Design a protein around this ligand. Structure first.
Ligand SMILES: [Zn+2]
Ligand SMILES: [Zn+2]
Ligand SMILES: [Zn+2]
Length: 178
């Protein structure tokens, strides 16, 4: 197994996947690494299994249909994995914890949002449809773009949104388009 966490790329107290060489800090893995379970399979492995059990699940889909899906166990897992893929980028640090807004010439957003809040919301089963999770994730980057205006720091929201959107299209097998 790897000797660094797959998500934050640091050593420490790591839990090893039994079906692949990845390793994780307890709270870097989403959901948090489960207490017992021998063997244990990580979220990358659990997602691969869904795909292998239903190869047709990788045929193209319309985003509008994906968003209306109820958060049954497989869609819950897919959103957890998508959230994890955002945290895997080091630029997620900017969006992880609760932001505050005091900049000359800007007003803070009406509805602040951040990754750890989405994480808690998923853990607490607060989303009933995929749309709920996706809306809150897109809101993180939209709020950032609006607040930072013409400051070059706006680019960080574009960059992490692009990681989100690429992984969304991959995980939910969104029909490829030009
Ligand atoms: Zn970690
Ligand atoms: Zn694994
Ligand atoms: Zn099938």
């Amino acid at each position: 197994n790897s000797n660094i966490c797959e998500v934050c790329n640091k050593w420490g107290r790591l839990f090893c996947c039994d079906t692949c060489p990845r390793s994780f800090h307890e709270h870097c893995h989403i959901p948090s690494v489960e207490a017992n379970k021998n063997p244990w399979s990580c979220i990358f492995c659990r997602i691969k299994t869904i795909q292998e059990r239903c190869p047709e699940s990788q045929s193209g889909h319309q985003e509008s249909e994906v968003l209306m899906r109820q958060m049954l166990p497989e869609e819950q897992l897919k959103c957890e994995f998508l959230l994890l893929k955002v945290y895997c980028d080091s630029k997620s640090c900017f969006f992880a914890s609760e932001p505050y807004y005091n900049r000359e010439g800007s007003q803070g957003p009406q509805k602040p949002m951040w990754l750890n809040k989405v994480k808690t919301s998923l853990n607490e089963q607060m989303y009933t449809r995929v749309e709920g999770f996706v809306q809150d994730m897109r809101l993180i980057f939209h709020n950032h773009k609006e607040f930072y205006r013409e400051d070059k720091f706006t680019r960080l929201g574009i960059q992490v949104q692009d990681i989100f959107e690429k992984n969304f299209r991959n995980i939910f097998a969104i029909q490829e388009t030009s």
